[PDB]
């Protein structure tokens, strides 16, 4: 699990611009691995810094909690970002 | 039962906009197939994301539990959404 | 008995707003035709959905059990809703 | 901790021109040791006086709050100022 998650997080970082269509506020409802604290912090970050800058923090926070990749794949599908979801599933395998 | 429920769930998904008048909070009292856990989660989803986004999760959760279509038909009738109820009964047959 | 009960239940449904003063929690002590299960369910419904919405379920549940109209007339009198009690007796005759 | 922070703050002051590429508005999202009050004041300072002059106040404010050097190193990395981040880590050790 660790190897696979680390690899996926590394891939998201190197390919960040693939993920800049992701809207932090829209994706949060599908990420139950994030705590209430995480969600409030990310909302504030978004308010202060904008969505693009917050995406980095979203990914950084996701990778700390447990069971993030499955939910991230789900969340991407929930937002109709199927190619992105498939690209994540592919790296996580 | 499985074939009929899967078909009804597929129909609800393809015809989602038919069901966007459904109010999640109003319909919950008629859905005893949902666990207390399901109801609390759906309430939270509604709080965080709004009714429309929660409807998707409502339908997704309903289809997992047992005996959901009958109660969903009942719940639609309970909320005076008779045409919608009939449309569901029609697909479930 | 069936014809008379069905007629009374139909009348309660068509004239629901006449009965919205009825307090579910206050009326339960006078309804021994309801099972312990019925009472617990109705309490929960009341907790989740409020008295008005629960009244519909109260009437729906009453009509299934046996010997409900007599006790319902009694229960209305027990709650000092004499005109309502008389209106029910009148339809049940 | 005090000795190390004081030394780092002294180094930032003596080597201020190394840090004049730092953009106050860009760095604030990575400085959770700053209070909401601190952030509003620094924004105003920036509006009235420009980024260079505000950097002095940024550093002066950072050094008062607790746990500032770690976050400052983080914030420099967040803004892709890796050599600067490393230079701070080096002095703080």
Residue numbers in the entry:
A (entry chain A), B (entry chain A), C (entry chain A), D (entry chain A): 370 to 462
From the study:
It consists of an N-terminal CARD domain, a proline-rich region (PRR) preceding a poorly structured middle segment, and a monotopic transmembrane (TM) domain at the very C-terminus. The N-terminal CARD domain of MAVS is necessary and sufficient for forming active MAVS aggregates.
To understand the structural basis underlying the filament formation, we solved the 3D structure of MAVS CARD filaments at 9.6 Å resolution by cryo-electron microscopy (cryoEM) and iterative helical real space refinement (IHRSR). Neighboring subunits in each strand are related by an azimuthal rotation angle (ΔΦ) of 53.6° and an axial rise (Δz) of 16.8 Å along the helical axis.Video 1. We therefore built a model of MAVS oligomer by directly fitting the crystal structure of individual MAVS CARD into the cryoEM density map.Video 2. Overall the MAVS CARD filament adopts a densely packed structure containing three intertwined helical strands. In the structural model of the filament, each MAVS CARD monomer directly interacts with four nearby monomers: two from the same strand and the other two respectively from two adjacent strands. The intra-strand interface makes contacts between adjacent CARDs within the same strand while the inter-strand interface holds the three strands together. The cryoEM model predicts that the intra-strand interface is stabilized mainly by hydrophobic interaction or hydrogen bonds among residues F16, W56, Y30, D53 and L48.
